[PDB]
Ligand binder design. Structure first.
Ligand SMILES: COc1cccc2c(=O)[nH]c(-c3ccc(C(F)(F)F)cc3)nc12
Ligand SMILES: [Zn+2]
Lengths: 47, 162
């Protein structure tokens, strides 16, 4: 696993072309996330 | 030490999580190749994940990051899709759960769009889809996503051509 940028704790990846695409985020230490909810689902076929 | 507690669909907490899931579906540039073709989900269950040891590990690191970033944890709720979700809820996140080849570097990736995380449920690029049908757009088989508390601290802003 890589190290975060110097002086930083994460990276924010922000799409700049698709204006409807939201951000993605990267952490480099597992201790910076907690798996709070577990969601069970199906995707639905469009009508 | 992990226990899972079912939330009732009549609970405001359940409803909030479902609405964050449903409201952040978008169209993807692969036409559905990795994650499938859909506009919405059928939510079957939402469980709270409770592990004292993992929680303490998390809050200790949050406090270090907060202090380093001048008393600002910059904590978010974000989606995570992965073939290792069963391992993650029991053992916590670590380097085995990183996306080594990710375009923002080798680390653990989280999304604001639920549908982006849905692309990784069956592996990178959706792998070969569900185990039973080998279908990345399977409408039968049950999927799982995590909705996670994530400490960002000082976050480096990277614009990406996507
Ligand atoms: C660009 O990668 C991602 C962006 C936004 C969200 C996610 C996400 O929820 N999960 C993953 C992901 C990638 C690889 C692996 C694996 F290599 F460990 F299998 C797991 C999750 N990658 C993601
Ligand atoms: Zn299937």
């Amino acid at each position: 696993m890589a190290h975060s940028p110097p002086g930083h704790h994460s990276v924010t990846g922000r799409p700049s072309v698709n204006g409807l695409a939201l951000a993605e985020y990267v952490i480099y230490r597992g201790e910076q996330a907690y798996p709070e909810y577990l969601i069970t689902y199906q995707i639905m076929r469009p009508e | 030490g992990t226990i899972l507690i079912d939330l009732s669909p009549d609970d405001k907490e359940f409803q909030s999580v479902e609405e964050e899931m449903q409201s952040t579906v978008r169209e993807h540039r692969d036409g559905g190749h990795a994650g499938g073709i859909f506009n919405r989900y059928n939510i079957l269950k939402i469980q709270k994940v409770c592990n004292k040891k993992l929680w303490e590990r998390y809050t200790h690191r949050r406090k270090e990051v907060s202090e380093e970033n001048h008393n600002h944890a910059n904590e978010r709720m974000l989606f995570h899709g992965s073939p290792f979700v069963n391992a993650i809820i029991h053992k916590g996140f670590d380097e085995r759960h990183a996306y080594i080849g990710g375009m923002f570097g080798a680390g653990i990736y989280f999304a604001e769009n639920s549908s982006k995380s849905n692309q990784y449920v069956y592996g990178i690029g959706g792998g070969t889809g569900c185990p039973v049908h080998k279908d990345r757009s399977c409408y039968i088989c049950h999927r799982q996503l995590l909705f996670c508390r994530v400490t960002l601290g000082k976050s480096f802003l990277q614009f990406s051509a996507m």
